[PDB]
Amino acid sequence: RLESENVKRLRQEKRLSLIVDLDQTIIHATVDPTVGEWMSDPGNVNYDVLRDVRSFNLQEGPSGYTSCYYIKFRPGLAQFLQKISELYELHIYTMGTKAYAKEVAKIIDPTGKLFQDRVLSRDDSGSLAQKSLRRLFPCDTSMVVVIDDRGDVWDWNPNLIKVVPYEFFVGIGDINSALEEQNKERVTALELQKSERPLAKQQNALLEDEGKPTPSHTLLHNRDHELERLEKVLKDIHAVYYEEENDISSRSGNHKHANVGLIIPKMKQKVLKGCRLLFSGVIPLGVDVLSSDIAKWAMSFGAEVVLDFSVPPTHLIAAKIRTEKVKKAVSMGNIKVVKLNWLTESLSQWKRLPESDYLLY
């Protein structure tokens, strides 16, 4: 009764549901103790961009291994969640532990107003590898949208809006990327990040180089504007859904409704429609091309993927290597040989970029 009732409640509130991933989507976390050092020194070159960083401690594992996690909020997060919460009922669904999720929630939702108890972690999601809409909406996913920096954990679900991974702490990826005892590998990874101090090593390297650009000698920067773009995409999805929902329901007395799983692909398919892609040296010889992540991501944006020249492709995505495919493409004509960057960047910006800026040879 709760589920079906929820759908009715949301449509009455004129809202949709939004599932939010944490790491590299709305925050970036690291346990490199270098952060605490830089934050305690107003004269440090990284001090200013770390002013809004927040931290907390967690004891993980049977041995009670403790770590101080430093969390950076993606630029404009507060306003983003504020505005989007008026259009979407927020959910947190992370691969981090329940304790991790709760600590992050206390910091981005102190009052508990945005998300509430609508937090999902690897402790209760039901899977340590993939995420599923069915864990939250078993029978009806027509109103749930997802924002995550990874498409593979969602099996490139049509309801997903892949976001550009947020990397504030340069060089640090996702700290939450057999079983329990084998997870001694988590302690091992956290320990290694603490001892290597990747941030300090990189900062030292930038300072040791006798280049020229002064600000480029500073490791950390605030240059991200991904949430502004995302806000526009989510507001658009919301409008289209309720616009069609009104027409769809009125014409069928509520028997039929709108479906974000149909709306989102529609929008995406316009970006690379007309493109037929041939990859060269981008996918391992041991990986099925058409089922690879890059292929599914490109295809979700209207791109067609081919395996040869039998039907000459519009683009040749080359690994910056000089191979027979590159040669063959050039000797031919009308192929645009471009770096992988052209594709990933175009896909990330929901806009087909100028091939002119990504040539190889």
Ligand code: ALF
């Ligand atoms: F917070 Al994650 F995949 F980054 F669940």
Ligand SMILES: [Mg+2]
């Ligand atoms: Mg993530």
